[PDB]
Ligand binder design. Structure first.
Ligand SMILES: Cc1ncc(COP(=O)(O)O)c(CN[C@@H](CCC(=O)O)C(=O)O)c1O
Ligand SMILES: Cc1ncc(COP(=O)(O)O)c(CN[C@@H](CCC(=O)O)C(=O)O)c1O
Lengths: 192, 428, 428, 199
């Protein structure tokens, strides 16, 4: 009953009328984050409407910005291209900026084993679940968290009312409807 | 079930309430507290059913279906659906031929995303003042801002009013500049009967759930005039590795919403026009100016306060604004400001970090921006009121007339407005 | 997508249209062709979502949920959900203790189902005249209709107006008769602040999709004052082998609709009340009379034609009715007859076949009725018109005001009404 | 699978806004009838919101009314009670009034074989499908069809008359009548169930 389950959640959220990411009383994105924080053992989560958002958050969150370098030995062609667009070079002397896991229906049930690593930044790409482009950054580094949110226009900082300075920003805000589907998938596939 | 359905219908307001005591002074409000919610978007059975249709199709088909359907309506030759308005503006700029180190002239009054799209295109925002009536990029101030580094001009159809495309396109041809529209408020807005988004070499447009034409969360679309620009945009996506793709969930809501857009638009148009006509008879308020050739979409309805009335002698304009905000809010009309700070004075354009280390701002000569450079914009901010959700929502007659009664009520109490404004503390 | 969504909003009608030429004589109609559709039921997102909730539950649990929920609102101590209003009236009669051969006093003016429920209960309908203002069972009769076989009186809250419960209940106590309400139009109708369907020993109520409170197709509910009557109805179902059960699908739609009933009811009440007030000023029309203690549901809005106006001298009333029917229809107000013939003169009560071989009619007297017996009911039929969908739907102000203007327009052309009416050819 | 398909149909019909049995442009019930006529090779179909309705239609359609008798050999307890309520007696020497088949999810797929039979009146009960009480009478007998429609308040001939302003069947006299009109939403769900299970 996949088509039904997806249809029901969409119907549920549409009926509530709360389909804006920036609305008060939007609970779907928090619920999604809370589940992934429990499954992993990470203090902080940031939701994006693109894997690009999660990648930039991880890089900028560790001060890997234009002119800097990092270890791009595990990047696919797409992310190599993004790093180059950001103005970030390569060095094998440095550690990798993140660990990336592509989540699909094949491996969604085993998310607890996947998200239990010794990784500084865990990027979960949920794009292949088929609800739309979506990625979540998980970390214990608060600076990475704060800079990843600040990078988003109308991010956490903008909503709840000269500390962490924003530079270039993007709309990586995730659609609640999309978030609600992923949240349902996680619950349905035994991740509490 | 959890639903947003409003259980209390708006009663027809008594016109005698024009004579009533102000609610700020303990009077009965024009709009009761139970009648202050407006639902937006207008989610109907069609939207739910549409999800059950689109869920069965490949996600890419749903997205391209939406993009094609909306493109045909807008009449743009080419279109790319995106995850957001911001990203659509980025692709629009790049597609049109904006490159690293180029300057792009942009209004100082707009949402941050307009300017962040320029920076993402690795170009330098060059902020300009607005026309005091249209609130759009002033074409008279383009000769002052143009340099050898200028490549494009980026007008915003702010509030839903078309910018002066005739004057801006004239300037662009003379100076061999590209023209990039931000049509994020201007869904269904026309100039000479042509839709905003088809005038510039390219255009971006937010399709967020708070826009007159809403998709199911976050979304946008880029329009291109020539195939060359469309190709360059697609090339950039291939080369950059950015994933700016739209969700099918968002797209699906768009498909159904688009079938009812003309209906909702018609209500918006009649409502806003009636309000303009009614405000015209007041001493204190004037609705937004609309050139003959333009059709306003009325995403936001900006009202000019007559701060030059003799009752307001020696009262700062900003106190009149604050007083009227308080008074109107007590009556049940939520007149707030959309944008309090001009973009030059937002943190990103003060620190100018960009991608890091000041890129791409350091590619060109810096500019120290001062408040003196934007008098019309600042004049707007301290002498104007904005209705957003009130008139974006295609409200019923009783609600529309409730607004009319409110403004007429306040207009009868100009002396009392002056007194309240006087007693507001100085704000440095 | 197949949708009933109306794409054209109703514009505010010009007051000057009161002065316009009639549409029947080539004039512009008050309501354009494109504004003549009316949505009913009001199907919303909630209703679609409710189906997705209820489909997961056992069907009997959904039906029971609905029955219980609606029963508490109405305030009936016991309820049985049924497949139809007709069946609910049958169970109501049997439960209250109507037996084969008994006589039931019932108005000659109601829907066939009312009398057909009596025959189902194996009882003989005894038809009575109506009050000329309420159009309900006349209490002033009855005395002449009561018989040794008489067991019950069956008032219909016709159009949604409460019948004279106080008078009829008093008559029922004097003669030890049962009181069975037909509340099939009287959803949310009250007398002394109490809902129709709680007054009688039992009551039946249509819950079809064309009623103010609609379920999802065909449905009904029977109410009982005492457990004795409830048990007897349940026993009859067991003994008879009749399957009168409600569909969960119909019930589910009821569950969601019930959450929004008060809202739609409020709009109906205001709309109807305004039209009554407006018709009061007219020379030709009068809205329905409402006793002080009663609240009309306004399922149907019956209007009295003043056929005694001097212009109508020597013009049969039925011609005035037909003419005004044509005239109003051309303007875009679908005024029509609900019933044309009184139940006595419908084929079932002429042939008196019943279950076959004249059962159960041959248990009683000849029961030969003539038109002489029903002067008030026949007068009503000759001199009234009814709005059904117009005011059943909780229409927006623009539509309500279009109705008002239509009647005022026709009222200004009474001389033309007479001329048109006179030209109509003779009929039986 | 099933929950989605049921939800889709209901969503589709609700979206159309055509949920009254007596509405113009109501096409769900017509479709249900056509499939069952095609499957059974019977000329006439009549839909009911109850098995009781199909039973009464089959009986009265053959002038098996109050005071008459028929063969009740094959009746279960419920129908035996219904025949008694109608005032219809039993005789082993008379023919059976109809053949009844209870349709459920177990035998829905084999509807071709079930309904293709010599029986001159076939009653299909769809109540166990779980969309609500529903039955369909299938016959080549035009007179059973006409009388079965006539016993329904706002039956086919009442609808025809209430749209054309002319009696569509004068010779077919009504006696007692019932509301056995089926909800379009229920009929649509059953129509979908048929289409998805071969027939
Ligand atoms: C003028 C302008 N340009 C660009 C954007 C960027 O579009 P996104 O889809 O957010 O990437 C916005 C959105 N800013 C506000 C406007 C809301 C309104 O005025 O109704 C927003 O999306 O909340 C905008 O208002
Ligand atoms: C007076 C009366 N009693 C009982 C019923 C119940 O019959 P069911 O159809 O079995 O529920 C009706 C419904 N008759 C009309 C009423 C039309 C209206 O007033 O909107 C009908 O349902 O078409 C009725 O009008």
């Amino acid at each position: 009953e996949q088509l039904f389950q997806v249809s029901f959640v969409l119907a549920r959220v549409l009926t509530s009328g709360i389909i804006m990411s920036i609305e008060k009383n939007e609970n779907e994105l928090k619920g999604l984050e809370n589940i992934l924080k429990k499954t992993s053992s990470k203090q902080y989560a940031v939701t994006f409407n693109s894997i690009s958002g999660a990648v930039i958050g991880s890089l900028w969150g560790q001060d890997i910005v234009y002119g800097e370098a990092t270890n791009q030995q595990s990047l696919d062609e797409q992310q190599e291209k993004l790093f180059k667009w950001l103005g970030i070079g390569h060095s094998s002397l440095l550690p990798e900026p993140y660990t990336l896991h592509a989540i699909n229906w094949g491996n969604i049930s085993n998310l607890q084993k996947i998200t239990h690593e010794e990784a500084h930044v865990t990027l979960l790409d949920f794009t292949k679940l088929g609800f739309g482009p979506c990625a979540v950054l998980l970390t214990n580094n608060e600076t990475i968290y704060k800079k990843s949110e600040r990078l988003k226009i109308f991010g956490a900082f903008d909503l709840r009312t000269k500390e962490i300075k924003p530079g270039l920003q993007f709309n990586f805000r995730l659609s609640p409807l999309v978030g609600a589907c992923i949240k349902m998938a996680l619950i349905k596939m035994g991740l509490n | 079930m959890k639903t947003d359905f409003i259980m209390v219908p708006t009663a027809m307001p008594d016109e005698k309430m024009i004579n009533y005591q102000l609610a700020i002074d303990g009077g009965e409000p024009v709009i009761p507290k139970a009648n202050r919610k407006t639902i937006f978007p207008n989610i109907a059975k069609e939207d739910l059913f549409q999800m059950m249709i689109s869920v069965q199709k490949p996600e890419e088909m749903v997205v391209s279906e939406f993009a094609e359907k909306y493109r045909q309506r807008v009449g743009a030759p080419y279109a790319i659906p995106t995850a957001s308005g911001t990203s659509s503006l980025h692709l629009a700029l790049v597609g049109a031929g904006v490159k690293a180190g180029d300057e792009v002239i942009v209004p100082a009054f707009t949402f941050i995303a307009t300017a962040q799209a320029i920076v993402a295109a690795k170009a330098i925002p060059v902020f300009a003042d607005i026309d005091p009536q249209t609130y759009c990029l002033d074409p008279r101030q383009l000769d002052k801002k143009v340099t050898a580094r200028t490549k494009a001009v980026m007008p915003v159809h702010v509030h839903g009013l078309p910018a002066d495309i005739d004057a801006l396109a004239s300037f662009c041809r003379q100076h061999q500049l590209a023209l990039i529209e931000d049509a994020s408020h201007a869904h269904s807005a026309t100039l000479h009967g042509r839709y905003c988004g088809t005038f510039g070499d390219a255009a971006g447009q937010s399709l967020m759930a708070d826009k007159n034409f809403p998709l199911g969360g976050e979304a946008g679309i880029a329009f291109f005039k020539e195939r060359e620009s469309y190709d360059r945009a697609l090339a950039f996506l291939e080369e950059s590795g950015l994933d700016y793709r739209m969700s099918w969930v968002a797209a699906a809501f768009g498909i159904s919403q688009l079938d009812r857009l003309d209906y909702y638009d018609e209500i918006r148009q009649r409502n806003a026009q009636r309000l303009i006509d009614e405000l015209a008879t007041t001493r204190l308020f004037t609705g937004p100016m609309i050139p003959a050739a333009a059709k306003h979409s009325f995403n936001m309805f900006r009202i000019k306060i007559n701060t030059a009335l003799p009752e307001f002698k020696d009262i700062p304009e900003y106190k009149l604004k604050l007083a009227l905000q308080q008074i109107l809010n007590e009556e049940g009309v939520f007149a707030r400001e959309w944008q309090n700070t001009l973009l030059p004075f937002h943190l990103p354009f003060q620190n100018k970090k960009g991608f890091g280390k000041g890129y791409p701002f350091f590619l060109g000569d810096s500019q120290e921006y001062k408040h003196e450079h934007f008098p019309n914009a600042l004049q707007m901010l301290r002498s104007t009121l904005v209705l957003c959700r009130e008139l974006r929502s295609p409200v019923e007659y009783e609600k529309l007339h409730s607004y009319i009664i409110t403004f007429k009520k306040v207009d009868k109490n100009i002396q009392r407005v002056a007194e309240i404004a006087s007693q507001i503390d100085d704000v440095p």
